[PDB]
Design a protein around this ligand. Sequence first.
Ligand SMILES: *C(=O)[C@H](CO)[C@H](O)CCCC[C@@H](C)C/C(C)=C/C(C)=C/C(=O)O
Ligand SMILES: *C(=O)[C@H](CO)[C@H](O)CCCC[C@@H](C)C/C(C)=C/C(C)=C/C(=O)O
Lengths: 404, 404
Amino acid sequence: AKNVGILAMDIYFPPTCVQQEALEAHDGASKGKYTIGLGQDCLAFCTELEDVISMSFNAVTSLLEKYKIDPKQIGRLEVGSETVIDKSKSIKTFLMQLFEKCGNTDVEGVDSTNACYGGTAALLNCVNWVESNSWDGRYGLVICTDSAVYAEGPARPTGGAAAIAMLIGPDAPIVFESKLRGSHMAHVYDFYKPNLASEYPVVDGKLSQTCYLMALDSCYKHLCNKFEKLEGKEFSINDADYFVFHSPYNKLVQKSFARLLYYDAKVQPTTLVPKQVGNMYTASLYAAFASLVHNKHSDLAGKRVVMFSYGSGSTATMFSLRLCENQSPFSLSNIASVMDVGGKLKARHEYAPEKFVETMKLMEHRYGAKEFVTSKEGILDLLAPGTYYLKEVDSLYRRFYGKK
Amino acid sequence: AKNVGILAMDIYFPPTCVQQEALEAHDGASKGKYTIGLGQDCLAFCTELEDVISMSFNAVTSLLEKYKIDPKQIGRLEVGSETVIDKSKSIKTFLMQLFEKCGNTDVEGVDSTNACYGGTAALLNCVNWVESNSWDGRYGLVICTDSAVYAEGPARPTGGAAAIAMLIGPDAPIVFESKLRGSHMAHVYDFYKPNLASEYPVVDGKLSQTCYLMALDSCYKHLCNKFEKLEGKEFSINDADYFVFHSPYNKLVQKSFARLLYYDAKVQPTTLVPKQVGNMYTASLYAAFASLVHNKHSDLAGKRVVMFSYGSGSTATMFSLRLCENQSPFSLSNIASVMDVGGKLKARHEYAPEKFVETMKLMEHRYGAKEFVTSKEGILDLLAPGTYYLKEVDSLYRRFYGKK
Ligand SMILES: *C(=O)[C@H](CO)[C@H](O)CCCC[C@@H](C)C/C(C)=C/C(C)=C/C(=O)O
Ligand SMILES: *C(=O)[C@H](CO)[C@H](O)CCCC[C@@H](C)C/C(C)=C/C(C)=C/C(=O)O
């Protein structure tokens, strides 16, 4: 099992969105409070028809269909998220629905949690599984999936939603440099969700500030130590071609890279999807990476891409990747083609801020609700053909999905 | 990295408990409804002073102190559970508290969830991490931790609480047979917690019945296929010395082994702690294993121990272990000594059923509560010296712990 990493990749985000500038006007906010202060342009959100589960079906289905992967060929499936549907039943069990009507039930892995890190945790687990004595010769599959509902308050411009699927195995175009990494993990009360009934976090801004920079510094310093062992020198900004970050809002990206000290060369091409879609939590780092493949796929072979994953609480890892052109279907070039990031941004559907706010109120009401049917007219029409959607939640909280 | 598996092990459960027979009398129940119907003898529960976090500190502290492990020597720490304290902040971040005042913050891993499987998922992840190219030479550490609150109804005799800590690395006394395994994973609505506000599950008994047996059968059949490849024959009950099961209640253990078709030889010594402590969810399989080491440590070298992990939803894995006597501190003999299962059962403190029920009411009230100080008189006296306990939860849901 050699050159293990990401073989294939896809992204889904809901087509429904609201413009940050329009939102500034609708709110009390002075010009550029979101577009400049946050550095964000557009916000994708889930309507009543979409959730972290349906988004996951879209992403996994698309990957398997487009890279032509046989479902029997998946041996480990793992999900990273902080969007809790059930306190017992993992998002992973839902995803097994896709694997039953071809009889592939022997599939390791479950859900991994810590804030916007769980996707990273799951990815590392799969890479390790491919390299282990237990490996059965099959692909791993990692999903990152998250969605935010803030109907009110200062949090509301900071939401977003997506799902990412990544195929893992040997001889990849996106190879992990196994030892080029640094982690930092601590017990902090910086940004957390201690109110089971509520989606609203408890945020300690000043401590969040200190704890994030401490992690980034420490992760950086530890990667540098391992670089010194690996290649015989200190690691600097010059020792990678690109830096990709957890990107809840673009201003954090700017500060973070600055802290490492170029941005136009090394970081700017990672900003497309995060800036247009919003905070994607566990999927944010990977959407930033997806933007890089989209923008630069023809320049990426031979290059080093450094990746920094954060999650409040806190858990962080900086790690490194070596990219090369390979053979289709698992090539940098085929990955860009399949993701069709440009096609997905054109296919979007904009909401006036008021209709966005109404939809957010609705989402508040449905959160923890049971025994309801979703309302489809005018919304279902906006979803791409084939899209999984929520039809109803029964009186026992069971969720039933449709396709189209 | 060879002969990877469990190097060292410890268990903590709260010393406070209620007798199943006394409980039958207190409830409407006819003689032997719990002791025979469930096959259970005693029930350990957390009082206001103890939770999955404090129990985890007890287990990890004890392992590191008693097997004399240096905290800097842990490279990956993972937690399995279905007891949700926060929807963002993992139990793992809490545990990092132990690693800061010696500066070991570079520690991979987070929380793994699916029902009473998450501990297994986490264990597999660590074994894989030791065998991966990313492995840095250090120990992995796995925690399983869970606690139940049922103040009312038919669920109430079926609770329990514990935490288990397992040290992972090469040259172990408890070696994984990498390929001797079978998993089964499906999308079922059998036993789940869809009500974020509530601890009470939704149970579909008849479907739970069918889905559990399907998993056990399928896991079994897949392990048999891999056995045929590995050793050239079909796997039968005769091809292992012991079978250890997820053990929420002892009657499930009896049926499950019967389904594989001896019990007195192969399964009976795995029943001590589960029967005295109750349902330990993610830690239950491993407490059953701990009981086996306790009872049979001097017979275990050379033997095969088959292990079956279940979690509703559903996720299952049957896997196999090869045990041998090794060198202290990581010997079957030293592990039995350190766990002192006999010492812990003698040190217990019994509650009349009424006082148990009052304590359960209290736990209902504190669940999701903030801004309270715990009441200590009469309870703190019952905890072993050194025990971590909850002092208070502040107005921002932060939890503060004491020791003693
Ligand atoms: C994910 O773990 C979490 C929400 O679930 C979130 O996306 C990551 C936390 C982001 C922390 C910022 C809110 C605070 C931060 C450190 C901003 C700073 C330091 C930028 C700067 O100018 O320094
Ligand atoms: C853990 O995943 C879960 C609670 O969190 C629980 O401990 C495991 C589910 C146990 C399922 C039983 C309640 C149903 C069962 C199949 C009993 C049977 C089949 C025994 C028998 O006689 O067959």
